[PDB]
Amino acid sequence: MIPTIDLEEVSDKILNQKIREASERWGCFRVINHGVSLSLMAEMKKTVIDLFQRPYEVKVRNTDVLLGSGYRAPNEINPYYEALGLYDMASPHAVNTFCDQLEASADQREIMVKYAKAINGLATDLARKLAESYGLVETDFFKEWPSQFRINKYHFKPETVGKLGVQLHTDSGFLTILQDDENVGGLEAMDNSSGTFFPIDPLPNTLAINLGDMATIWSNGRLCNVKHRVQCKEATMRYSIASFLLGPMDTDLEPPSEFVDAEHPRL
Ligand SMILES: O=C(O)CCC(=O)C(=O)O
Numbered sequence: 001m002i003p004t005i006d007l008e009e010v011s012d013k014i015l016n017q018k019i020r021e022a023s024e025r026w027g028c029f030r031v032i033n034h035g036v037s038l039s040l041m042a043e044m045k046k047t048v049i050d051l052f053q054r055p056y057e058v059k060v061r062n063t064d065v066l067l068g069s070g071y072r073a074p075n076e077i078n079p080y081y082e083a084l085g086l087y088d089m090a091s092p093h094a095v096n097t098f099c100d101q102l103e104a105s106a107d108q109r110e111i112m113v114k115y116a117k118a119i120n121g122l123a124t125d126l127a128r129k130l131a132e133s134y135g136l137v138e139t140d141f142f143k144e145w146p147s148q149f150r151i152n153k154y155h156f157k158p159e160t161v162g163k164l165g166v167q168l169h170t171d172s173g174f175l176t177i178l179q180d181d182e183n184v185g186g187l188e189a190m191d192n193s194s195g196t197f198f199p200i201d202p203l204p205n206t207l208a209i210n211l212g213d214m215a216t217i218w219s220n221g222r223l224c225n226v227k228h229r230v231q232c233k234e235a236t237m238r239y240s241i242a243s244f245l246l247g248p249m250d251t252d253l254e255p256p257s258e259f260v261d262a263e264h265p266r267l
């Protein structure tokens with residue numbers, strides 16, 4: 001079972017410890033009292049739904065910056081999935097460019113600006129708490145790490161229900177913040193120990209956090225890069241918003257040396 005962590009827990013050592021053990025054992029957790037405006041989240045979702053109904057020929061303008069950034073229409077590899085997004089989410093220029101590409105309204109534009117700044121703050125905050133949970137000196141390790149924004153539209157038809165919508169996988173970055181679909185469940189993750197899956201049901205006003213491959217590398221294997229998938233449980237439309245804190249992009253990720261011991265040989 002995925003644990004729910006209270007980010008307004010009064011005690012730093014309890015809070016950081018909860019986060020670390022969740023990140024090591026399950027590779028994921030929910031956060032409550034995250035500090036992201038609930039109204040901003042709903043408006044971001046409204047903006048997402050509306051953005052996906054832009055002209056196809058406009059959507060196609062959402063060009064890759066990184067391979068996979070930008071638009072992907074459903075195809076025969078993964079037929080139920082449509083997506084948009086931008087690289088370097090921390091850059092107001094990058095966000096604006098994305099909004100220029102999708103011809104967002106001015107109102108929409110500034111919804112995106114505010115969401116990105118909020119979500120990216122939650123991300124830096126969570127990452128720092130992870131550094132703190134290990135008593136690291138390098139409590140700023142991520143300060144030059146770029147983020148990637150990606151909004152997703154899942155189309156499940158009656159054919160799809162009972163089966164999956166996306167196959168089992170790990171995020172390649174450090175940390176992911178997911179705003180799932182309020183009224184359409186289906187996200188599942190595998191317990192590495194058992195091999196069994198458990199669901200990540202969309203609990204209202206919460207945000208889902210999971211760790212990716214970069215976190216495992218950085219932590220020399222202590223942090224779990226959770227395997228997850230979304231399974232179709234009903235043939236409806238489905239929207240989700242994801243913000244990825246990635247590893248460094250120019251450099252190569254190797255761990256703070258505090259993680260590499262004679263009992264933790266390098267990977
Ligand atoms: O759409 C979802 O429910 C999860 C999204 C996800 O896993 C991703 O964008 O990497």
Ligand SMILES: [Mg+2]
Nearest residue numbers: 170171176228
């Ligand atoms: Mg994912």
